[PDB]
Amino acid sequence: TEKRGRIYLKAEVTDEKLHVTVRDAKNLIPMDPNGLSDPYVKLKLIPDPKNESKQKTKTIRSTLNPQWNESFTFKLKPSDKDRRLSVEIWDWDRTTRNDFMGSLSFGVSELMKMPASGWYKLLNQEEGEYYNVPIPE
């Protein structure tokens, strides 16, 4: 439906490189029967027809408030001017398919103008690939 928690990130473009820091997320919704989840974050630059830009944080077991503190770097190219940084939280599972938890995205153009920083509301999978919602509140 709609409330999936929030995540704190930092993203910036410097000298043809995109730097992203995934700090932590709060109030995630349990996808595991146990009432918790095993979250990890997938980062990519889309569209990614060749599927070459994927990066992911480690999976943190049994928590609804993960603190990854991981940084990533993407080497950019001109065409990236029209791409977006997609950030998705998934719930790792031992025996079933991993479940989508929440996501968002930023335009590489957006970031070149203004770096991202702070808390953001997690969105549903489809919509997450098109926009982001800061939470300065």
Short description:
7% of the residues lie in helices and 45% in strands.
Describe this structure in words.
The protein has helices spanning about 110-115, 125-130, and strands at about 5-15, 15-25, 40-45, 55, 65-75, 85-90, 100-105, 115-120. The protein is built from 2 helices and 8 strands. It has a single domain, classed as C2 domain (Immunoglobulin-like, Sandwich). The strands form 2 sheets. It has a 4-stranded antiparallel sheet with strand order 5-2-1-8. Strands 4-3-6-7 form a 4-stranded antiparallel sheet. It is globular, with a radius of gyration of 14 Å. With about 140 residues, it is mainly β. It is found in: Cytoplasm; Cell membrane; Mitochondrion membrane; Nucleus. Belongs to the protein kinase superfamily. AGC Ser/Thr protein kinase family. PKC subfamily.
Blueprint (SSEs and pairs):
Blueprint lengths: L5 E9 L2 E10 L12 E8 L8 E2 L10 E9 L8 E8 L7 E9 H6 L2 E6 L3 H4 L9
PDB class: transferase
Keywords: Protein Kinase PKC, transferase
Assembly: monomeric
Any descriptors?
137 residues; Protein kinase C alpha type; four-stranded antiparallel sheet; Immunoglobulin-like; Protein Kinase PKC; transferase; mainly beta; monomeric; globular; 2 helices
